[PDB]
Amino acid sequence: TTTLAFKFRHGVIVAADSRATAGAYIASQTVKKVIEINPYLLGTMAGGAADCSFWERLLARQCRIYELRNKERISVAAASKLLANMVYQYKGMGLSMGTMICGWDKRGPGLYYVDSEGNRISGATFSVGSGSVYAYGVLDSNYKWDLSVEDALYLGKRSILAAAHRDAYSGGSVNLYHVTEDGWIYHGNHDVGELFWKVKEEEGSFNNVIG
Amino acid sequence: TQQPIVTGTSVISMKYDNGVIIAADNLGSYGSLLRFNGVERLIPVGDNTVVGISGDISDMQHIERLLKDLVTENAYDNPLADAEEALEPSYIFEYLATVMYQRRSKMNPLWNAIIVAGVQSNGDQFLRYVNLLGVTYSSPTLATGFGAHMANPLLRKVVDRESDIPKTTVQVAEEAIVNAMRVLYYRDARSSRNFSLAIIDKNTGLTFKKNLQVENMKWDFAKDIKGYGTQKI
Amino acid sequence: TQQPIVTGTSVISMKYDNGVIIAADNLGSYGSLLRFNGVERLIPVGDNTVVGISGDISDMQHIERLLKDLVTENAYDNPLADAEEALEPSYIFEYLATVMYQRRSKMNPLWNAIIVAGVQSNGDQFLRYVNLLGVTYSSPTLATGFGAHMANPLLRKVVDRESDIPKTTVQVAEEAIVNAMRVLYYRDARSSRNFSLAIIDKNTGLTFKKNLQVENMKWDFAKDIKGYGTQKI
Amino acid sequence: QFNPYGDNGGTILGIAGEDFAVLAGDTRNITDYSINSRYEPKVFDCGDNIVMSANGFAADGDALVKRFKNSVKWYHFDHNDKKLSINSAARNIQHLLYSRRFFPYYVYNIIAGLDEDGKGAVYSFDPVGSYQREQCRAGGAAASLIMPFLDNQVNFKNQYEPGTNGKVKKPLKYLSVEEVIKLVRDSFTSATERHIQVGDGLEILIVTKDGVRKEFYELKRD
Amino acid sequence: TTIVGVKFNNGVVIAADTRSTQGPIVADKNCAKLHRISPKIWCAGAGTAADTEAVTQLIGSNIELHSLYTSREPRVVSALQMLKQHLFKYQGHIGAYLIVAGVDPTGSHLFSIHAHGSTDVGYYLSLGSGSLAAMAVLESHWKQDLTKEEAIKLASDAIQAGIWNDLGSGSNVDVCVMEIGKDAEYLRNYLTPNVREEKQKSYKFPRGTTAVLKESIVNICDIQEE
Amino acid sequence: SDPSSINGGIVVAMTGKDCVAIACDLRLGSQSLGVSNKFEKIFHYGHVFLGITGLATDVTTLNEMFRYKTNLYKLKEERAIEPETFTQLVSSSLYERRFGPYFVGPVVAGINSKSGKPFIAGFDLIGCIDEAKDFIVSGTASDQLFGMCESLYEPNLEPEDLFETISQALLNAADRDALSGWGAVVYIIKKDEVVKRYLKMRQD
Amino acid sequence: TSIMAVTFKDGVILGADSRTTTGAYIANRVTDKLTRVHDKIWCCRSGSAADTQAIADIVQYHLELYTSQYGTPSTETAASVFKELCYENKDNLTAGIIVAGYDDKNKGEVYTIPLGGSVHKLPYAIAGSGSTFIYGYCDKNFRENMSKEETVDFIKHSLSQAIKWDGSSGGVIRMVVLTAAGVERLIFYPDEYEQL
Amino acid sequence: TSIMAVTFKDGVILGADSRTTTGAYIANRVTDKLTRVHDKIWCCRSGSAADTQAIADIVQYHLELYTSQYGTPSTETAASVFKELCYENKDNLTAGIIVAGYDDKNKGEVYTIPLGGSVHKLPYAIAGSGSTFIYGYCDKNFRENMSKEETVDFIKHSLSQAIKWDGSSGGVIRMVVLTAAGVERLIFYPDEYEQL
Ligand SMILES: *[C@@](C)(CO)[C@](*)(O)[C@H](CC(C)C)NC(=O)[C@H](Cc1ccccc1)NC(=O)[C@H](CC(C)C)NC(=O)[C@H](CCc1ccccc1)NC(=O)CN1CCOCC1
Ligand SMILES: *[C@@](C)(CO)[C@](*)(O)[C@H](CC(C)C)NC(=O)[C@H](Cc1ccccc1)NC(=O)[C@H](CC(C)C)NC(=O)[C@H](CCc1ccccc1)NC(=O)CN1CCOCC1
Ligand SMILES: *[C@@](C)(CO)[C@](*)(O)[C@H](CC(C)C)NC(=O)[C@H](Cc1ccccc1)NC(=O)[C@H](CC(C)C)NC(=O)[C@H](CCc1ccccc1)NC(=O)CN1CCOCC1
Ligand SMILES: *[C@@](C)(CO)[C@](*)(O)[C@H](CC(C)C)NC(=O)[C@H](Cc1ccccc1)NC(=O)[C@H](CC(C)C)NC(=O)[C@H](CCc1ccccc1)NC(=O)CN1CCOCC1
Ligand SMILES: [Cl-]
Ligand SMILES: [Cl-]
Ligand SMILES: [Mg+2]
Ligand SMILES: [Mg+2]
Ligand SMILES: [Mg+2]
Ligand SMILES: [Mg+2]
Ligand SMILES: [Mg+2]
């Protein structure tokens, strides 16, 4: 996998590839690694597909009962912490999860990294997965706070592409999301095969590759 | 988790036009030691089912008791225990298969391979296999252990598919089983000459044959074999 | 590196006023199996030395051949081979000790424990031990294997230190050795009743006794022992 | 040491049409280099126009199917004979699988049927409950042999329109049941040639609004 | 693999299947497991494929040189002895399991040979993963004083048992008959009971379907004159 | 750790009517990392073509080795080596390292200059020959290639038809393998003309 | 150990050596391996000394309680109680037991219970490390319906050989005769049985 | 395996079963384990089939070369050559061999060579996995200076029991008689020896 997310002026961008692997064998290439917890909350998946899917779906149900008892949408911090405490019970037992809880709440846009090891970190920029290391190069070099929605969406898309190209266990297609205070907005599924050639021509990058 | 101590080898079986046949030798081995020579590994359940068991003998004796108790329990408050609500081969098998899978799921298995052979109420032939892992399958011929490697090929020459079953008589089927038992005696180092054979026919019922022996063996050609290559004397 | 297969148990020995005594049973064990009942483990070298060997019997037979060849080689171009330039116990021992240490240093040992017993030219008693590691030591009493644990305590009651040697006669020393061999038969699970005994005296020379048996055993008290605690019948 | 798992071989294949769905699988059961059965059904009609096949370790596959069939039975009892939709079954199966996250069902699992809009649906599961709706999916021993062929012949991957030279793709035209069954038979005939655990027979279950139909074809017995 | 050897009245016959595996995958559907050591000495091989070939080519080469040196037709016992000593020396690491048969001035012979260097004599033998399925047939149908035609039938029936019942064996049956006073007849694909059925569809593509970037002529010829 | 899957790669060869074709991917990796998209795995010694998959150092080494041996063969024999003869030389050379083998999966392809007969062959890492009539596959996506070739292939294909068949077999197999791709090349070989085509594929 | 039990005309006779070992050291040379679980139901013990003692003690408790409620138990019943313990605790035990008893109705009966916890009713039985060496001798020399004197000689000769070849067997030969007449203990010393 | 060699009045007789195994599979049921290293010096082979064949072949070569230079070798000499191979290569071999031969001077002689490579001259010898079960029977029934017919029956009965109890032993009983009269091969089939 490659997944990323970052805070900025106009909310938070969330992007991810779609490849699923079983050794060298590419089992699927149509996997949704972004889970919609509520119209204002997203969750990313990396590592154990089954683990990430189960626990984040179970979290979405915790976040919903919260809204019913409290007449109030759960905060990003509280949601991230419920997950963290849930997976902490099974620590050392074999769980493999690398997630980011992205959303907009009362404190503005929120972004937390949560994993099966026990980490829970608030931050403006994250990337988790086998291809995260490639994505960080593009993010760190081009990331501002004063970024337009159009340019921010492109950055997250271009970052996954960088990783999808180099990392053997990343690719397929890019799923984009933009989270505002009026909720998240899906910005499509983009095949890396087609996207790569397009970006190569328009941007001039990947000069080493022939096409 | 354990290891098997006293063991029973192959159990072989096949379907024929009117029923099923099943056979197994009378040996209880203790590693390489052929310890117990009078062990019955075919266990009838009523007059319509025979359970053939291989593997650990202590676990076999346990299963034998579960089956005996099953008959006792089925008769309780059951006026039709010797008629419509009698035990069927399919009931007996599913019970065992349930137990075997539960025991493997607790990491404390019954170290056996079992073949349930019988004839149902409607006259249909029943033949199904189950083992220590809870794995089940059915086929026109079934065999455990070495029999799977040596007997099945011979029995599949008689009944290669489902459509060959009606064409196969009891005389032909028994002949094939008896031949397979001879071959296993030639080639299986944990087998015995003495064996038991059971036939469950939809017309003539259950016939249980004990104290059978492998006969018509070929050994005479051994006298001409000398050395391992170059030796002449 | 290997493992011992066919093995010999304890060899026991002690000094007395005029010489040395050495003894060992006639058994060649094959694990828990008491395979070979006629094995001689005391090997005389001339009329002044006896080498007692325990451990691997194939390695013992090898050493036995080295010693036989040593005698042959010493006689070569040696007019005084049966006199002044005859083989001494100290020569024979140092040779073996050299071989044992060299073999362990190549990580391919002779899997034995050896006691060389004899009387020197000047009448001095010789008694020294060597094993598969090349480890050597001398004492008024010496024993290998189980004998080290059971025989030495009994023999050290007769000769506790160097000054007790002149006070110890051949009749007393032999009596102690014979008693120790009985105790080892009671208590060592890899021992036999039959044994050989050798005396090397500075006056009467080499006396080699074969086909000795452990006698005067106590077993009668066993009849009164019943159960393991509470049982009365 | 006791090993609670085993490998019974077998291969399965699900393809979703526009108004139908197929679930195919070979009928061969094996341990190591021995054949247990040449005809041991692996694909089942579970009710409510849903077909299912779980295998690898036969004993775990039989148990999962048995449990899901039971889940359908109790869904009717508890919710007024309501029809269990394919998406609801998929989610239910996830929870059956994850209930043994620390002693997994050692199986590949595929279900097929029709969605609530009447269109064909195929869902794929990993041993611990990660599931995906797909158009085409093979599972089991020869999954890696078959899937690339289906990427090419069902989704027209790496196929472009002549004359344009890589500028315009082959358009995604839907497939008929007759065209799909051809791909299924060719897939399994090819897998039988190069995989030793695949052969003997091929059983196909087709699902339409009218119900569930079966088709059986022989395969090589070597 | 399944391989067998059967003696008869005036000679000996060997047979083999034609499958070669790489795990659960079939690498070759029509592999040739019957090897010629000398004109009238043939061996069938099971185990590590390269080893059965290499060891056979080597001993066959040395047998040919021996035959030339001695001005005699090679003997089966010579091939047997040379093989077992070679295999014993490599202590089983050369995974060749062979059935060696042939006719020579001494008569007809049939031996088996294992990777560790042990040999066995018999009237009927079987090696490989399907050896049990094949031996079941041989033990059921073999008799003394077989004819050539009866022996070929028995041998191919034994291989078929392996083909059908053993997953490590499949495809076709190869046979080689070595009769006294005759040329050895090598019957490649004696039986062909596993032909693939016609495919339902043709997957021939329209020309221009594949996207191309560059084209170029490859110069395979040498440097030219002028 | 597994030497045969560190660098990744695939090779496939097919026969046609009076023609042969051999193809390969262009990827060289260090496990998950992609290092080069120009690592061609097909070499030729005169009119005989050799594709090699597996450990890249051994691929490079064996090419240099067979170039060495075929150049000497030619100087002594006064003629180019043929595919049947070259196939035996590859087998001989691999088995001489029986107990310290090159971690490779070679594939030979060519047309006998005298008989005009198309020829392909495959080997395991220690030298066993697999002489096939239809096709040969090798690499990390060998299972995938077997599935594509066994269903797409039909005998007696014309050069321009064979090109499409082998290209689609390679491309779709590579797209189901993480360790294969990053470009592809196809050689179409006839008795006295050889065309080489680079394919356009997804670069992930 | 070397243990055996043999049925004969008038009942049954149990036999055993008297050696218990810790490696090659003989921890006790006058052991009594023939233990009583009821008046005329005895057992021969082989394997772990601790395990076989613990088992025999529990069985004696069960049969004592059985007797208080239901009267004298059968030899088959005693063998079943042994089995239940040996089978259900097979993972944690190392016990090879031979059960022998005398009824007036059933007369002499012998049941052997090896490691797994299986039960086998036999005319005679042998067990222990030393039994391996006398399978051939016992099979050739055993007859049914022997006399008391013939059966004593059969056991004496059999255990003599077992002791001769097995290092883990030795000492005295103990025997227990179970008949209608009562319970007789016999003992035979090395000087007697070694010269056979 | 089950092998034995027995000296008697007129010479010596070798005996063996015919089973060779690969685990529980019987790879050959008509094996000839009685192998000739010289005209009247034979051996019984147990252990690895490959190792014992390689050894016997080397010994036959050594004794053939001995004979060409120094005339007929003694049975002791043959046993020494076996020993030298088995002892010096003990780390890499698994061979249990019994050497038997007939001289006119020394008459019948038997040497056994177990795993370690030690040599033991005996009146009779038994070896192989199946020998364990007949130590008692053979010790009780062996006499010195038996007749040919008595010795054949002794071996037949002994190997019959060994085969009966050992799964690694079976098939036919082969025998080789070594006397002044010459060399006689005997064979006994299951139907004959099982009913003993
Ligand atoms: C990138 C693509 C890889 O790092 C991402 O991290 C993605 C994240 C997405 C899918 C949410 N991760 C994977 O693709 C992930 C990698 C992985 C595999 C196994 C454990 C942890 C991480 N892949 C999976 O989770 C696959 C998804 C399947 C192919 C749809 N699942 C498996 O491989 C399953 C799960 C196994 C399992 C996990 C925990 C306990 C028990 C079992 N395993 C199998 O299907 C068995 N496997 C089949 C292939 O042959 C080998 C055996
Ligand atoms: C039946 C079919 C199976 O028992 C027969 O016994 C045949 C015998 C005939 C063909 C002579 N045996 C095989 O087909 C044999 C089975 C086998 C496999 C592995 C070990 C021993 C036996 N198959 C082979 O030998 C193949 C032949 C190829 C397909 C042409 N070779 C391999 O599988 C090699 C094994 C090489 C080897 C080296 C050292 C010791 C033992 C074996 N394996 C590979 O090539 C796998 N891998 C591919 C990627 O590159 C790295 C190696
Ligand atoms: C013959 C000897 C063989 O079958 C008999 O069966 C007799 C039976 C009579 C005594 C009941 N068996 C023994 O004597 C028996 C043999 C034995 C040994 C170890 C395990 C099982 C059986 N010996 C013992 O039980 C002795 C009795 C002590 C000396 C009083 N016990 C030990 O040797 C204990 C055993 C502890 C144990 C280990 C594993 C499983 C169960 C129990 N061992 C030790 O004290 C340490 N010992 C010495 C160093 O080597 C390790 C063992
Ligand atoms: C009886 C059986 C026991 O003492 C006899 O001694 C006979 C003697 C005659 C044949 C000389 N011995 C055997 O039959 C002998 C038993 C044996 C087995 C293993 C090691 C030593 C002795 N059997 C064999 O030697 C067979 C003969 C082959 C089948 C023709 N060989 C094997 O079993 C080989 C030996 C490899 C080996 C292993 C360890 C040490 C030395 C050699 N083993 C295998 O092929 C492995 N086999 C396949 C996979 O399953 C495990 C067993
Ligand atoms: Cl005790
Ligand atoms: Cl042999
Ligand atoms: Mg197949
Ligand atoms: Mg790829
Ligand atoms: Mg990638
Ligand atoms: Mg003793
Ligand atoms: Mg036997």
Short mmCIF file of N, CA, C and O and ligand atoms in Angstrom, two decimals, chain G residues 1-2 17 19-23 25 27 31 33 45-53 92 94 128-130 166 168-169, ligand 3:
data_model
loop_
_atom_site.label_atom_id
_atom_site.label_comp_id
_atom_site.label_asym_id
_atom_site.label_seq_id
_atom_site.Cartn_x
_atom_site.Cartn_y
_atom_site.Cartn_z
N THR G 1 12.01 -52.27 33.50
CA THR G 1 11.15 -53.45 33.87
C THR G 1 10.72 -54.65 32.99
O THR G 1 10.50 -54.51 31.83
N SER G 2 10.58 -55.82 33.60
CA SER G 2 9.97 -57.02 32.98
C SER G 2 8.77 -57.52 33.80
O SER G 2 8.93 -57.96 34.94
N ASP G 17 10.02 -58.60 37.75
CA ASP G 17 11.36 -58.43 38.29
C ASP G 17 11.30 -57.40 39.42
O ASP G 17 10.21 -56.95 39.78
N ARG G 19 13.69 -54.54 39.78
CA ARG G 19 14.63 -53.45 39.51
C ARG G 19 13.93 -52.15 39.15
O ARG G 19 13.01 -52.15 38.33
N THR G 20 14.35 -51.05 39.77
CA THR G 20 13.96 -49.71 39.34
C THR G 20 15.21 -48.86 39.19
O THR G 20 16.08 -48.87 40.06
N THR G 21 15.28 -48.13 38.09
CA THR G 21 16.51 -47.44 37.69
C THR G 21 16.35 -45.93 37.61
O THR G 21 15.25 -45.41 37.43
N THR G 22 17.48 -45.24 37.75
CA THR G 22 17.61 -43.82 37.45
C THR G 22 18.79 -43.71 36.50
O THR G 22 19.94 -43.59 36.93
N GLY G 23 18.51 -43.78 35.20
CA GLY G 23 19.56 -43.90 34.20
C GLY G 23 20.13 -45.31 34.24
O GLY G 23 19.41 -46.27 33.96
N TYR G 25 21.88 -46.22 37.14
CA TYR G 25 21.93 -46.52 38.56
C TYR G 25 20.67 -47.26 38.98
O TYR G 25 19.57 -46.87 38.61
N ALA G 27 18.22 -47.71 41.58
CA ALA G 27 17.72 -47.00 42.76
C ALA G 27 17.14 -47.94 43.81
O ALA G 27 17.17 -47.64 45.00
N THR G 31 12.38 -54.11 44.47
CA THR G 31 11.10 -53.45 44.26
C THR G 31 9.96 -54.46 44.15
O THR G 31 10.14 -55.57 43.64
N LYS G 33 6.68 -54.69 42.25
CA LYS G 33 5.91 -54.14 41.14
C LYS G 33 4.54 -54.79 41.01
O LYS G 33 3.72 -54.37 40.20
N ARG G 45 3.09 -53.24 37.30
CA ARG G 45 3.38 -51.85 36.94
C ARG G 45 4.68 -51.71 36.15
O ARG G 45 5.70 -52.29 36.50
N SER G 46 4.61 -50.93 35.07
CA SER G 46 5.79 -50.57 34.28
C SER G 46 5.67 -49.12 33.84
O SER G 46 4.57 -48.59 33.73
N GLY G 47 6.82 -48.49 33.60
CA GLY G 47 6.87 -47.08 33.23
C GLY G 47 7.32 -46.25 34.42
O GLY G 47 8.15 -46.69 35.21
N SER G 48 6.77 -45.04 34.54
CA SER G 48 7.11 -44.16 35.65
C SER G 48 6.62 -44.76 36.97
O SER G 48 5.46 -45.18 37.08
N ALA G 49 7.51 -44.81 37.96
CA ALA G 49 7.17 -45.33 39.28
C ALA G 49 6.16 -44.43 39.97
O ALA G 49 5.24 -44.91 40.63
N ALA G 50 6.33 -43.12 39.80
CA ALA G 50 5.43 -42.13 40.39
C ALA G 50 4.03 -42.23 39.79
O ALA G 50 3.03 -42.26 40.52
N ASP G 51 3.96 -42.27 38.46
CA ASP G 51 2.69 -42.33 37.75
C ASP G 51 1.92 -43.61 38.07
O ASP G 51 0.72 -43.56 38.36
N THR G 52 2.60 -44.75 38.02
CA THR G 52 1.95 -46.04 38.25
C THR G 52 1.48 -46.22 39.70
O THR G 52 0.47 -46.86 39.95
N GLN G 53 2.22 -45.63 40.64
CA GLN G 53 1.82 -45.65 42.05
C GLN G 53 0.59 -44.77 42.28
O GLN G 53 -0.36 -45.19 42.94
N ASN G 92 0.00 -36.64 30.07
CA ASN G 92 0.82 -36.40 31.26
C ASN G 92 1.31 -37.66 31.97
O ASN G 92 1.96 -37.56 33.02
N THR G 94 3.06 -41.81 31.91
CA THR G 94 3.94 -42.80 31.30
C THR G 94 3.78 -44.08 32.11
O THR G 94 4.56 -44.36 33.03
N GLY G 128 6.85 -54.07 29.58
CA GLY G 128 8.10 -53.54 30.10
C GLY G 128 9.19 -53.61 29.05
O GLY G 128 9.05 -54.31 28.05
N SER G 129 10.28 -52.88 29.29
CA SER G 129 11.41 -52.84 28.35
C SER G 129 11.97 -54.24 28.05
O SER G 129 12.36 -54.52 26.92
N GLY G 130 11.99 -55.10 29.06
CA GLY G 130 12.55 -56.44 28.92
C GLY G 130 11.66 -57.44 28.20
O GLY G 130 12.12 -58.51 27.79
N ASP G 166 18.01 -57.71 29.28
CA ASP G 166 17.65 -56.32 29.57
C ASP G 166 18.40 -55.82 30.80
O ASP G 166 18.34 -56.43 31.87
N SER G 168 17.73 -52.95 32.19
CA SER G 168 16.69 -52.30 32.99
C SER G 168 15.83 -53.30 33.76
O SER G 168 14.86 -52.91 34.41
N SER G 169 16.17 -54.58 33.68
CA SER G 169 15.48 -55.63 34.43
C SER G 169 16.49 -56.43 35.23
O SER G 169 17.63 -56.62 34.79
C1 LIG I 3 11.68 -50.82 33.84
C2 LIG I 3 12.85 -50.18 34.53
C3 LIG I 3 11.53 -50.06 32.50
O1 LIG I 3 10.17 -50.07 31.95
C4 LIG I 3 10.36 -50.64 34.75
O2 LIG I 3 9.30 -50.21 33.99
C5 LIG I 3 10.42 -49.76 36.02
C6 LIG I 3 9.02 -49.80 36.63
C7 LIG I 3 8.84 -49.90 38.12
C8 LIG I 3 9.92 -49.20 38.83
C9 LIG I 3 7.57 -49.18 38.42
N1 LIG I 3 10.57 -48.34 35.76
C10 LIG I 3 11.43 -47.54 36.37
O3 LIG I 3 12.23 -47.91 37.19
C11 LIG I 3 11.40 -46.10 35.96
C12 LIG I 3 11.94 -45.96 34.56
C13 LIG I 3 11.58 -44.74 34.11
C14 LIG I 3 12.44 -43.68 34.24
C15 LIG I 3 12.06 -42.44 33.80
C16 LIG I 3 10.81 -42.28 33.25
C17 LIG I 3 9.94 -43.34 33.13
C18 LIG I 3 10.34 -44.57 33.56
N2 LIG I 3 12.19 -45.31 36.89
C19 LIG I 3 11.69 -44.30 37.59
O4 LIG I 3 10.55 -43.96 37.51
C20 LIG I 3 12.61 -43.57 38.51
C21 LIG I 3 12.15 -43.81 39.91
C22 LIG I 3 12.96 -43.00 40.87
C23 LIG I 3 14.41 -43.29 40.70
C24 LIG I 3 12.61 -43.47 42.24
N3 LIG I 3 12.49 -42.15 38.32
C25 LIG I 3 13.28 -41.44 37.55
O5 LIG I 3 14.20 -41.87 36.89
C26 LIG I 3 12.94 -39.99 37.48
C27 LIG I 3 11.82 -39.94 36.50
C28 LIG I 3 11.20 -38.58 36.47
C29 LIG I 3 10.40 -38.56 35.36
C30 LIG I 3 10.93 -38.15 34.15
C31 LIG I 3 10.13 -38.15 33.02
C32 LIG I 3 8.81 -38.56 33.11
C33 LIG I 3 8.29 -38.98 34.33
C34 LIG I 3 9.09 -38.98 35.45
N4 LIG I 3 14.09 -39.29 36.93
C35 LIG I 3 14.99 -38.69 37.70
O6 LIG I 3 14.96 -38.65 38.92
C36 LIG I 3 16.11 -38.02 36.94
N5 LIG I 3 16.61 -39.03 36.02
C37 LIG I 3 18.06 -39.19 36.13
C38 LIG I 3 18.78 -38.28 35.19
O7 LIG I 3 18.25 -38.48 33.89
C39 LIG I 3 16.93 -37.96 33.82
C40 LIG I 3 16.04 -38.84 34.68
#
